[PDB]
Symmetry: C3
Amino acid sequence: HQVIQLKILDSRIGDTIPLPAYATDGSAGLDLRVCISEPMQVAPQQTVLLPTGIAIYIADPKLAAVILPRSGLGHKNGIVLGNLVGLIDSDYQGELKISCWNRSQEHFTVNPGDRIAQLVFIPVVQASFEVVNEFTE
Amino acid sequence: HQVIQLKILDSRIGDTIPLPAYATDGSAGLDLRVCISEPMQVAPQQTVLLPTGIAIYIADPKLAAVILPRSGLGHKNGIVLGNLVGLIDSDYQGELKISCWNRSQEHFTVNPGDRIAQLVFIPVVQASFEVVNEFTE
Amino acid sequence: HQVIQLKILDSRIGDTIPLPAYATDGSAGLDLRVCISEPMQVAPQQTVLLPTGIAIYIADPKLAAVILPRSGLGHKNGIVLGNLVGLIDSDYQGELKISCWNRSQEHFTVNPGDRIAQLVFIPVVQASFEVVNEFTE
């Protein structure tokens, strides 16, 4: 494993709303829950910014995280991400927030504590470009 | 390379519908074909769940797969994924199914055997969180 | 770091429109700018193909790149990608082009040189399948 610092920004996290955790030993992603005080209505085509109540600090520049829709919410309810895929840089230390976009024709309710996205830690490579007149092998 | 077990769930696979395979030695992804008996109409804004007739077993918890739209279908026809990006965990052993979403204003026909998404195997990192009051270096 | 060849296809690149570069030492992605001669209107639901004026040659088959929406453009303006996520293979040598899709209900102007997507280099694994009757450990 790799250690990632997490700062709890809302006292509900770790009490009434669990920290993110891997469901199984074989899970690639961590479900991300929303930290809100009352149910949030998401109308068809609406985008709403939803706080998680946590911040992470990846720190290692060879690692990033991506935030993806949940498969069931996306397929069944059209509850996806307004920016489609979120990218979390190694030096990002702000609260994780979810751009929740309803692409469906049905109104949707997000309840406090609901899982609405997933977080996946991936290795990344920082490239150095070499400007060339023609590509070579 | 890395060995990934594949189970054929539909006898058409490997006969009339090819197994997924890399197009070139430099390909990052594998096109995923649909295993259906007749053409499937996908109306504007419709989401349909399309079977592939295969299951995979990645097994290695340091590896995952993502399922992405094809670039031409997505750009030209608006034929993309209802959950935008699929994430396949290392311990997932069910049939691969595609959430096919038509985001365009044009009706689209999916024929038996058509490639409609691509599969990419990526390394993933399982993080262990350290809850901190303030981030440190 | 890893060296990636870049070919400049439009003389504006490196003069009036900067090469892609990492914003900070901890950045996972590189913003991609559009190489056009006049502002481009993107109507609600419209998809337009936007050139970058550069081509890259990753070459290493253990590496790929993905093209993602920018978080602010996607969340605030609904300016995302028509194929949702672009995948750049290691052997792709053509111009990088952005499928720019306006998923919002508001008209949007893309100016010459604007950043409208981001590029992330990721390791990829080329799998070899083993067709099995049942999965094993």
